Amino acid sequence: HHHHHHDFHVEEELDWPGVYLLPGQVSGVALDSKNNLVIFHRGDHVWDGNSFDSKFVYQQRGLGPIEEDTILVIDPNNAEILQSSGKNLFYLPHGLSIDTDGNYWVTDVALHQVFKLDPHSKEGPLLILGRSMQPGSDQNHFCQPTDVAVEPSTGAVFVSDGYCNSRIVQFSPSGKFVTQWGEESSGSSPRPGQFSVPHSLALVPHLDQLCVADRENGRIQCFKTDTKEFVREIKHASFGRNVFAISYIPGFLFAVNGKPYFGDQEPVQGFVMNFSSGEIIDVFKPVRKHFDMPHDIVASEDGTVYIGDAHTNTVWKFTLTEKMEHRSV
């Protein structure tokens, strides 16, 4: 604020070779305890108009599951693939997050399910939530579930359930339904506690909060994690129509929006917000390749930010910095 604008800026790390990877649609990103990037991709499977019918049931079961490894851990420096798994399990990968023990938490929009996986196991999922290929809206069904966040202090499993639902569901560490909140965003304006496609979750550990990217409303909703009380709404004209994904590190909320329609004024970008005020302090995009559907984002306390694209099938590494003078502008 000494010069006209703001001093924090996010910039692509150009010496990171992970941009040269050729995965399928990249649906989820996360960081493991060694700060390695972990991605969740769709191989040769694509989400299109012939994937689901009118009742949200998956059409291409006979093509089988994705045959190639679907989860990759990627070195933060040389971008080499350190390990891979997720072979012969998934149909349309979506969310990926990692709990405090290092377990993977994954969602599938075709299966309508949520998986807990031990990364160092050879004997299949530790937990499966929801019913295979069966979309629903009760305590034991999902409808195209989008993301999962697991609270390190309680072990509470939160699932954002809604490309066709409008809820967040709490589960016990043993997979048992605890509680749920949220409903479809009502007539005229959308009111607090109402989702239209809860698409991304970020926990705020020491403020006991949970943040939700409401993609169709173009906004973020924050809730108190114990009481479920609506804390706050973040909405900016810069987002445009969508907020696809969010990530928290102390001090900052990071977000990606959606691609503009023809005529739209708001480009596709990463966003950096001051977490307290909720205000956008920085806007960014890659130098190599381009955003089309940036779909998930994960930030590290060390200042690293990763983004995966579900259309250009790419992951980028970025770095948050504060500089005395702005190299650009």
Q: Binding residues for Fe ion, per CB under 5 A?
A: 1-2, 7
Q: Is 199 annotated as a binding residue?
A: yes
Name the residue whose CB lies closest to Fe ion.
Answer: 2
Q: Which is nearer to Fe ion, 5 or 232 (CB)?
A: 5
Q: Is 94 annotated as a binding residue?
A: yes
Please state, in angstroms and rounded to a whole number, the distance separating the CA atoms of residues 215 and 256: 10
- The span of 54-62, 97-105, 222-230, 277-285 binding Ca ion (CB under 5 A) equals 97-105
Q: Is 42 annotated as a binding residue?
A: yes
Q: How far is the CB of 9 from Fe ion (least distance, A)?
A: 11
Residues within window 296-325 making contact with Ca ion, judged by CB under 5 A:
296
Please state, in angstroms and rounded to a whole number, the distance separating the CA atoms of residues 239 and 266: 7
Please state, in angstroms and rounded to a whole number, the distance separating the CA atoms of residues 279 and 17: 32
- The span of 4-12, 212-220, 288-296, 302-310 binding Ca ion (CB under 5 A) equals 288-296
Q: How far is the CB of 5 from Fe ion (least distance, A)?
A: 8
Please state, in angstroms and rounded to a whole number, the distance separating the CA atoms of residues 252 and 264: 27
Residue 323 CB-density burial (10 A; 0-12 exposed, 13-18 middle, 19+ buried): exposed
Q: Is 311 annotated as a binding residue?
A: no
Binding at 28: pick from Ca ion, Fe ion, none (beta carbon under 5-8 Å per type) = Ca ion
Q: In which element (H, E) is residue 147 found?
A: strand 145-150
Phi, psi of 61 (to 5 degrees): -60, -40
Q: Which is nearer to Fe ion, 2 or 122 (CB)?
A: 2
Q: Which is nearer to Fe ion, 2 or 120 (CB)?
A: 2
Please state, in angstroms and rounded to a whole number, the distance separating the CA atoms of residues 39 and 41: 6
Q: Is 236 annotated as a binding residue?
A: no
HSE of 127, CA atoms in CB hemisphere, 13 A: 16
Q: Is 163 annotated as a binding residue?
A: yes
Residue 66 near residue 59 (C-beta atoms within 8 A): no
Measured between alpha carbons, how far apart are the two ends of the chain, in Å? Answer: 14
Q: Is 215 annotated as a binding residue?
A: yes
Binding at 7: pick from Fe ion, Ca ion, none (beta carbon under 5-8 Å per type) = Fe ion
Q: Token pair of 9, please?
A: 């800026």
Q: Which is nearer to Fe ion, 237 or 329 (CB)?
A: 329
Q: How far is the CB of 104 from Ca ion (least distance, A)?
A: 10
3-state SS, 208-240, equals CEEEEEECCCCEEEEEECCCCCEEEEECCCCCC
Interface residue with Ca ion, options 24, 28, 145, 182 (CB under 5 A): 28
Q: How far is the CB of 296 from Ca ion (least distance, A)?
A: 5
Binding at 1: pick from Ca ion, Fe ion, none (beta carbon under 5-8 Å per type) = Fe ion
Q: Contact between 135 and Ca ion (CB under 5 A)?
A: no
Closest CA to 96 of 36, 55, 52: 36
Q: Is 295 annotated as a binding residue?
A: yes
Q: Which is nearer to Fe ion, 2 or 55 (CB)?
A: 2
What residues are designated binding site for a protein? 42, 163, 215
Residues that bind Ca ion (CB under 5 A): 28, 30, 96-97, 296
